[PDB]
Curated annotation (Swiss-Prot):
Region span, Disordered: 122-149
Subcellular location: Nucleus, Nuclear pore complex; Nucleus membrane
General function of this protein: Essential component of nuclear pore complex. Could be essessential for embryogenesis. Nucleoporins may be involved both in binding and translocating proteins during nucleocytoplasmic transport.
Assembly and binders: Interacts with GLE1. Able to form a heterotrimer with GLE1 and NUP42 in vitro. Forms a complex with NUP35, NUP93, NUP205 and lamin B.
Residues of the full protein shown: 864 to 1337 of 1391
Residues with Phosphoserine modification: S194
Organism: Homo sapiens
Disease: Atrial fibrillation, familial, 15: A familial form of atrial fibrillation, a common sustained cardiac rhythm disturbance. Atrial fibrillation is characterized by disorganized atrial electrical activity and ineffective atrial contraction promoting blood stasis in the atria and reduces ventricular filling. It can result in palpitations, syncope, thromboembolic stroke, and congestive heart failure.
PTM info: Phosphorylated. Phosphorylation and dephosphorylation may be important for the function of NUP155 and may play a role in the reversible disassembly of the nuclear pore complex during mitosis. Disulfide-linked to NUP62. The inner channel of the NPC has a different redox environment from the cytoplasm and allows the formation of interchain disulfide bonds between some nucleoporins, the significant increase of these linkages upon oxidative stress reduces the permeability of the NPC.
Record's protein name: Nuclear pore complex protein Nup155
Family: Belongs to the non-repetitive/WGA-negative nucleoporin family.
Tissues in which the protein is found: Expressed in all tissues tested, including heart, brain, placenta, lung, liver, skeletal muscle, kidney and pancreas.
């Protein structure tokens, strides 16, 4: 009906590919004339609709058409920098207007993957010599030159890669890679190190939801540099600030970083930002290990089989906001050792508080031991106390003898054992020996109930005398 299209976006390319098959081979005939025709006689083709025309373009290996026509496309898509702030502005689509020009960009992305698969693959014969109906897309492999110039695809690779490495702008680099680099067998983005890789990586990291998909890549690819001894440089970026909560991986990181932890080493310039932060991380590491020990006990309890009804009233509200929450509050199993452990881990200074925690701990261990003790209640007590005194480096004001001693004398009173052995438990916990003398002299005055029955003066003085002369702190 007189219909006539002066400029054609795809018909020209379709016809030209028909001629490429029948008249002009891209690699061996009229390559420069084909480029020039591509720009000036196929300038109208510029933007090509992913269609049958593109399917017949796939069988030939030419790609200078892809890159330059895409340039003219970004010309006919972004007239004056529309693309630059498209990503650069960042997630405004939440409306009918935002998801508008994504069309044919997502199509070029999915299509690129389709092209990657079909172009990389082989013909019917190459995967299977005999040929049944042929899938459109795979390159045919027949009557290839005697010389091993048959494998054009290899330099096709080299060419397209140069295209990636070399461009006036970033248009065919960053823009057409969305559904190609996040699919199998893509090595261009990793090999290239553009000065814009890092900013896109930080932008992806900013959103936790976006970050998780790229998280393993996010740490490495984000940093061009080895980042040899980065500690909390990705940790600030790391989401949920999850240092002491899960403890099924936090300790894995703690050990795999602490068998290299270098404190006072001057590895990183900002002590306040890295040294101070990693110091807090070390405190948190103690927190996580201790809380994890709480978890392991409560989880493998036989007396407490399932843990369905108690743990979630604690976990759902705060999983691990603060250590003392679970250390002093969130332990239905009634652990008190955790309470004083977090009073040392999280410093609190009440003689009455510290003292009561001591009594609560002693009563907890004796009660558990009667229910279950390896040998002698005192021996189980020794197990627990060395465990506590090893994880916690002793603080001189935070480990007063006066507090422990009354309960130790209570234990000697209740459970009769060799006098040298209670001395061995306290001695092996590292308890101050000067304060041992001072406490055992203050306490002796007035014959306090704890020191009654005079079990030690029997042979303790002489045993400790000989023990000391041969050896210290014994």
């Amino acid at each position: 009906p007189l219909l006539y299209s002066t400029d054609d976006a795809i018909c020209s390319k379709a016809n030209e590919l028909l001629q490429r098959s029948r008249q002009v081979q891209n690699k061996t005939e009229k390559e420069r004339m084909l480029r020039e025709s591509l720009k000036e006689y196929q300038k109208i083709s510029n933007q090509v609709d992913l269609s049958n025309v593109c399917a017949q373009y796939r069988q030939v290996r030419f790609y200078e058409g892809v890159v330059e026509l895409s340039l003219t496309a970004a010309e006919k898509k972004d007239p004056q920098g529309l693309g630059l702030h498209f990503y650069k502005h960042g997630e405004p689509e939440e409306d009918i207007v935002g998801l508008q020009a994504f069309q044919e960009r997502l199509n070029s992305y999915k299509c690129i993957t389709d092209t990657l698969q079909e172009l990389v693959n082989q013909s019917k014969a190459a995967p299977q010599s005999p040929s049944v109906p042929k899938k459109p897309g795979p390159p045919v492999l027949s009557s290839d030159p005697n010389m091993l110039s048959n494998e054009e695809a290899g330099h096709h690779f080299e060419q397209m890669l140069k295209l990636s490495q070399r461009s006036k702008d970033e248009l065919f680099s960053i823009a057409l890679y969305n559904w190609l680099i996040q699919v199998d067998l893509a090595d261009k983005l990793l090999q290239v190190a553009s000065p814009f890789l890092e900013p896109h990586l930080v932008r992806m990291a900013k959103v936790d939801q976006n970050r998780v998909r790229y998280m393993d890549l996010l740490w490495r690819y984000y940093e061009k540099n080895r980042s040899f001894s980065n500690a909390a440089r990705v940790l600030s970026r790391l989401a949920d600030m999850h240092s002491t909560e899960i403890s099924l991986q936090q300790r894995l990181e703690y050990i795999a970083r602490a068998i290299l932890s270098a404190k006072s080493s001057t590895a990183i310039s900002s002590i306040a930002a890295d040294g101070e932060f990693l110091h807090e991380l070390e405190e948190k590491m103690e927190v996580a290990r201790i809380q994890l020990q709480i978890q392991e006990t409560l989880q493998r309890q036989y007396s407490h089989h399932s843990s369905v009804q108690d743990a979630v009233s604690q976990l759902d509200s705060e999983l691990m906001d603060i250590t003392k929450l679970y250390g002093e509050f969130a332990d239905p199993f009634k652990l008190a050792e955790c309470k004083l452990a977090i009073i040392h881990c999280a410093g609190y200074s009440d003689p009455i508080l510290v003292q009561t925690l001591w009594q609560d701990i002693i009563e907890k261990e004796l009660s558990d031991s009667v229910t279950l003790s390896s040998s002698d209640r005192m021996h189980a007590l020794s197990l627990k106390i060395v465990l506590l005194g090893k994880i916690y480096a002793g603080t001189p004001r935070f480990f007063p003898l006066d507090f422990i001693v009354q309960f130790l004398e209570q234990q000697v009173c209740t459970l009769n054992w060799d006098v040298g052995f209670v001395i061995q438990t306290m001695n092996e916990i590292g308890v101050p020996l000067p304060r041992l003398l001072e406490v055992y002299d203050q306490l002796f005055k007035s014959r306090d109930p704890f020191w009654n029955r005079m079990k030690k003066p029997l042979h303790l003085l002489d045993c400790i005398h000989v023990l000391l002369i041969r050896y210290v702190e014994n």
